[PDB]
Amino acid sequence: LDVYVNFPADGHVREIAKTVLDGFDLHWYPDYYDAEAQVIKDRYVLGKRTKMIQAISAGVDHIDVNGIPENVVLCSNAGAYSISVAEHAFALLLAHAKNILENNELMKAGIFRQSPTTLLYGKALGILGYGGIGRRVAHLAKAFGMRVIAYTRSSVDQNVDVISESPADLFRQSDFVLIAIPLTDKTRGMVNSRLLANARKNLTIVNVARADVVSKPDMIGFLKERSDVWYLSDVWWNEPEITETNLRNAILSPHVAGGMSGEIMDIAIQLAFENVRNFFE
Amino acid sequence: LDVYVNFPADGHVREIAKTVLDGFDLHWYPDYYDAEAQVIKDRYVLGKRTKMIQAISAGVDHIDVNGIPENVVLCSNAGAYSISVAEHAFALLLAHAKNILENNELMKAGIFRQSPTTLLYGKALGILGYGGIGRRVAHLAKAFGMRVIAYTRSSVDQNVDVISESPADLFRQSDFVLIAIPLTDKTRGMVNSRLLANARKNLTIVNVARADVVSKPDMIGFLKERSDVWYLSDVWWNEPEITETNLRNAILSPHVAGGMSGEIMDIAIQLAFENVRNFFEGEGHHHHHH
Ligand SMILES: [K+]
Ligand SMILES: [K+]
């Protein structure tokens, strides 16, 4: 009983709460209410009844965690983003597999011209990393009837058919490759010329991690060198002053696979409230 | 336990066969053998032990069906087509939902500009016609977390959450509508000004059936009025004399959803053997019309 949303929320946000938190009493900013659960963006406000703090963002390292009594549980909203990013990765991947751009252009020029498309069913999707995004993607991949090879030291679930032991090993078994891996000193530029060299024919790389996991000058030369390999990416080096983006064999998006600087996805609000409800069963 | 492949097959085909049918004795043409199962292209050979005949093609109209004895089950192989079509439908669907074309155009000119996208998760996908394509589409939709509403001439499966009463009722409960219904006298011109008026705000329509199930002037007229509505189609009227094709709120493709012409997807042959294996566990696929 009792939830306090610590940020300005329109009627659509309020609507979702009515739906998801039926049986709870809602309180909205600015009418502070000391509740058992408070949903936040960046800042929180402690009280006597605080039990759980639900962030709506993907991570929580931007909030003041030290200020949180160990009697209170802080939760992220990572699941919402795993979901949105996966949809996005598949949108890029399918756009290329079905040559959606090239055919659309033709068809609108009044040209009817048939060409084969790549089918996902029966193919191998290699995945660098296996966090929430990788898991969601794997879940989609299996539904599409793909085989999943993953390179990670994390635990995997039943949607992973093969744990690869090296990136190169992963590359050799993949028709598609998704980069969904943390950026550390070991992964920075891990995607270089030597790794790319292992690329199956018609390999399609999909990047929804960080641009630095990939070597820029290496990917550009590699993409020039292997005209059959495509690089589809939601991330680019030095956003927003992106340069060297006019490539033929690439499809790009401006880092919108998930959370946006300007707003809150309905799904984020949705899953945050659901997580609150689940926390109390 | 006995399968006879009544046609020339290579090592590729053979490997697939040994993997899928590992635990069945295989025989290869032309070393005929009276097996329980026969895989064919155009001709079958009757035996004394024949129980099942598996065509590797989608249709059997070129097969002497009338000549098949009553106890022998004839199966066909059409799964690849609906699989392919469902994949093409989600490709159009997501292209629009993630503003793929527009963002890509901007990014390539060095213009970094964020904008929100549409998510499939949690949304209602209305399917018009629940056949092989609609079933496959619904399997993918459930995976994406979508809710599924179907309008059909009976028979839906477990991946359908709501059966509608009419096409207008379907449009009323849908954020996305997929058209995968056969073109007949009652479906011709089916999608009209009157039906479209039911479209929720921002409705996205995907057509993987036939252009004629849709009234051309009504759709083109509705897209001007109702500019939030998009029409994504893999089929256009007339074809190839396409006209009138340069619409803003539309993404189109040249009837390539199910492949091309007499394209044989490498995956068809595997599905054929798999159905043989499933048939003998007692679970062949149900032969749904597309
Ligand atoms: K997106
Ligand atoms: K296609």
Q: What letter represents residue B55's amino acid?
A: A
Task: Give how far A67 is from chain B: nearest CA, Å.
Answer: 33
- Stated as kind and residue range, the H or E segment containing A118 is none
Q: Given an 8 Å threshold on Cβ–Cβ distance, is B114 in contact with A139?
A: no
A258: nearest Cα among B92, B140, B102, B119: B119
Task: Label the pairing between strands A250-252 and A230-233.
Answer: parallel
Q: What letter represents residue A196's amino acid?
A: L
Distance (Å, whole) CA B70 – CA B74? 10
By three-state DSSP, how is residue B289 classified? coil
Q: Chain B neighbours among A 4-43 (CB < 8 Å)? A: none
Which positions in chain B touch A176 (Cβ < 8 Å)? none
Task: Give the ligand at the shortest distance from the Cα of B90.
Answer: 2
Q: How far is CA A44 from the centre of its chain?
A: 26
Distance (Å, whole) CA A242 – CA B107? 8
Q: Given an 8 Å threshold on Cβ–Cβ distance, is B243 in contact with A110?
A: yes
Write down how long chain A is: 281
Are B204 and B93 in contact, with CB atoms under 8 Å apart?
yes
Which positions in chain B touch A115 (Cβ < 8 Å)? 254, 256, 260
* Phi, psi at A132, each rounded to 5°: -50, -35
By three-state DSSP, how is residue B197 classified? coil
Optimal mutation site among B85, B104, B133, B175, interface A, most CBs of chain A within 10 A: B104
Q: How far is CA A93 from CA A96, A247, B106, B260, in A?
A: 5, 16, 18, 20
Q: Given an 8 Å threshold on Cβ–Cβ distance, is A104 in contact with B101?
A: yes
CATH 3.40.50.720 domain extents, chain A? 1-81+259-281, 82-258
Which positions in chain B touch A110 (Cβ < 8 Å)? 242-243, 245-246
Distance (Å, whole) CA B261 – CA B50? 33
B147: nearest Cα among B121, B119, B117: B121
- Stated as kind and residue range, the H or E segment containing B60 is none
Specify the DSSP class assigned to residue B218. H
CATH 3.40.50.720 domain extents, chain B? 1-81+259-290, 82-258
Q: Experimental method for this entry?
A: X-ray
- Stated as kind and residue range, the H or E segment containing B6 is none
CATH topology of domain B1-81+259-290: Rossmann fold (3.40.50)
Are B105 and A246 in contact, with CB atoms under 8 Å apart?
no
Distance (Å, whole) CA A39 – CA A26? 11
Are B236 and B252 in contact, with CB atoms under 8 Å apart?
yes
Are B289 and B16 in contact, with CB atoms under 8 Å apart?
no
Are B68 and B89 in contact, with CB atoms under 8 Å apart?
no
Phi-psi region of B245 (alpha: psi -120 to 50; beta: other; left: phi over 0): alpha
Are A219 and A195 in contact, with CB atoms under 8 Å apart?
no
Task: Give how far B231 is from chain A: nearest CA, Å.
Answer: 12
Distance (Å, whole) CA B137 – CA B159? 10
A248 in B contact zone (CB under 8 Å): no
Are A127 and A93 in contact, with CB atoms under 8 Å apart?
no
Distance (Å, whole) CA A209 – CA A85? 10
Q: What letter represents residue A20's amino acid?
A: V
In our burial notation (b when 16+ CB lie closer than 10 A, e otherwise), range B113-124 reads: ebeebbbbbebb
Q: How far is CA A145 from the centre of its chain?
A: 21
By three-state DSSP, how is residue B114 classified? coil
A248: nearest Cα among A226, A217, A272: A226
**Residue carrying structure tokens 């459930």:** B142
B264 in A contact zone (CB under 8 Å): no
Q: Given an 8 Å threshold on Cβ–Cβ distance, is A139 in contact with B143?
A: yes
Angle at CA of residue A72, ends A71 and A77, nearest 5°? 155
Q: In what order do the strands lie in the sheet with B162-163?
A: B162-163, B147-151, B124-128, B176-179, B204-207, B230-233, B250-252
Per the structure block, which two tokens stand in for A138?
């794997």
Cα end-to-end span (Å), chain B = 32
Gap from CA of A230 to ligand 1 centroid (Å): 19
Q: Give the 3-state secondary structure percentages of chain B, helix then strand then coil, rounded to 5.
A: 30, 15, 50
* Phi, psi at A28, each rounded to 5°: -120, 145
Q: Residue A64: is it exposed, middle or buried by C-beta count within 10 angstroms (0-12/13-18/19+)?
A: exposed
* Phi, psi at A65, each rounded to 5°: -60, -35
Distance (Å, whole) CA A221 – CA A243? 14
Distance (Å, whole) CA A39 – CA A60? 12
Are B253 and B92 in contact, with CB atoms under 8 Å apart?
yes
Q: Chain B neighbours among A 113-142 (CB < 8 Å)? A: 113-117, 119-122, 139-140
A220 in B contact zone (CB under 8 Å): no
Task: Give the ligand at the shortest distance from the Cα of B256.
Answer: 2
**Residue carrying structure tokens 């960046």:** A42
Per the structure block, which two tokens stand in for A247?
């490539």
Angle separating helix axes B266-279 and B11-20, nearest 10 degrees: 30
Task: Give how far B144 is from chain A: nearest CA, Å.
Answer: 7
A266 in B contact zone (CB under 8 Å): yes
- Stated as kind and residue range, the H or E segment containing A139 is helix A132-144
Give the chain A residue whose CA is nearest to the CA of B92: A100
* Phi, psi at A266, each rounded to 5°: -60, -35
Q: How far is CA A124 from the centre of its chain?
A: 20
**The CATH classification of domain B82-258, taken from the options 3.40.50.720, 3.30.450.90, 3.40.50.2300, 3.40.50.970:** 3.40.50.720
Resolution, given in Å to one decimal, reads: 2.2
Q: Chain B neighbours among A 159-218 (CB < 8 Å)? A: none
Per the structure block, which two tokens stand in for A92?
């890029």
**The CATH classification of domain A1-81+259-281, taken from the options 3.40.50.970, 3.40.50.300, 3.40.50.720, 3.40.50.800:** 3.40.50.720
Per the structure block, which two tokens stand in for A137?
């993607």
Four-point Cα dihedral B88, B89, B91, B94, nearest 10:
180
Q: Residue A82: is it exposed, middle or buried by C-beta count within 10 angstroms (0-12/13-18/19+)?
A: buried
R_g of chain A, CA atoms, integer Å: 22
Per the structure block, which two tokens stand in for A42?
């960046």
Distance (Å, whole) CA A183 – CA B149? 41
Q: Chain A neighbours among B 66-105 (CB < 8 Å)? A: 80, 83-84, 87-88, 90-92, 94-95, 97-98, 100-101, 103-104
A211: nearest Cα among A253, A165, A169: A253
Are B290 and B84 in contact, with CB atoms under 8 Å apart?
no
Give the chain B residue whose CA is nearest to the CA of A138: B143
Write down how long chain B is: 290
Q: How many CB pairs under 8 A join A and B?
A: 181
Distance (Å, whole) CA A218 – CA A193? 5
Which positions in chain B touch A260 (Cβ < 8 Å)? 114, 116
Task: Give the ligand at the shortest distance from the Cα of A254.
Answer: 1
Half-sphere exposure of B141 (CA within 13 A, CB side): 29
By three-state DSSP, how is residue B3 classified? strand
In our burial notation (b when 16+ CB lie closer than 10 A, e otherwise), range B132-162 reads: bbbbbbbbbbbbbbbbbbbbbeeebeebbbb
